[PDB]
Design a protein around this ligand. Structure first.
Ligand SMILES: N=C(N)Nc1ccc(CNC(=O)N[C@]23C[C@H]4C[C@H](C[C@H](C4)C2)C3)cc1
Length: 247
């Protein structure tokens, strides 16, 4: 996250930190995610497409820091890794960038709600916030494009939803952005998501309720003018979500 402020999971209780186990013992951060139900975390396919082995992943809930523990945190294994079949990456655009992770602790249990571990509500069919609405993103991604390390503390920022008409302009993204995606940016172009934030949530207060409106997916650079962050439009994948979570 470029700009914004440091935060704690108590403020973003639905945030899930996904790491990958390496040959030896080193565990590195991969992507963000969101707990949509005690047993399910939703993230981005881009994060796992090159290493589809569910056994190599670890999911943390109630975690505020990258390489250090946080009391109340819970560690989970990935029972099932569901990648979207029609995922594809173009020059800039990442299509159907969405994934589901069924989690379970070593005792075979799912997440237990607490002050640091809470689920976020999914949107209603095709019901998205009006463009111009303020929403928040959270992640452990880069703070500057020139950084090669991720911040140690969770971050968050507020961005505004941009209409498809505006995001489809020539100087923005043109025809690369689709109706299955949502654009969001800071009117001042000072804050934005960046590498390492993929899979994280774009949360919007819709009708007095915190809703998982989007998933961090792609964008040209980070916090560059006329280049908004692009998010996977969750409301258009409800059938997909429901069909893979049932069983
Ligand atoms: N302008 C933006 N908001 N630009 C934007 C938007 C989304 C992203 C997120 N994209 C990523 O996190 N990329 C990866 C690319 C690969 C190495 C790591 C882990 C995953 C695979 C995801 C970083 C980047 C840049």
């Amino acid at each position: 996250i470029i700009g914004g402020e440091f935060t704690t999971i108590e403020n973003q209780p639905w945030f899930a930190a996904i790491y990958r186990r390496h040959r030896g013992g080193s565990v590195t951060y991969v992507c963000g995610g969101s707990l949509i139900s005690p047993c399910w975390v939703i993230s981005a396919t881009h994060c796992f497409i090159d290493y589809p082995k569910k056994e190599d992943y670890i999911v943390y809930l109630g975690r505020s820091r990258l390489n250090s523990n946080t009391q109340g945190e819970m560690k989970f294994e990935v029972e099932n890794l569901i990648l979207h079949k029609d995922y594809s990456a173009d020059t800039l655009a990442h299509h159907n960038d969405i994934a589901l992770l069924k989690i379970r602790s070593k005792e075979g249990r799912c997440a237990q709600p607490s002050r640091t571990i809470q689920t976020i509500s999914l949107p209603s069919m095709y019901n998205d916030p009006q463009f111009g609405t303020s929403c928040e993103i959270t992640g452990f991604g880069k703070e500057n494009s020139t950084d090669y390390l991720y911040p140690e503390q969770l971050k968050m920022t507020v961005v505004k939803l941009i209409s498809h008409r505006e995001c489809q302009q020539p100087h923005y993204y043109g025809s690369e952005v689709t109706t299955k995606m949502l654009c969001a940016a800071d009117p001042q172009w000072k804050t934005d998501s960046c590498q390492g934030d993929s899979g994280g949530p774009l949360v919007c207060s819709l009708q007095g309720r915190m809703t998982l409106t989007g998933i961090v997916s792609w964008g040209r650079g980070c916090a560059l003018k006329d280049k908004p962050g692009v998010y996977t439009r969750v409301s258009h994948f409800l059938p997909w979500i429901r069909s893979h979570t049932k069983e």
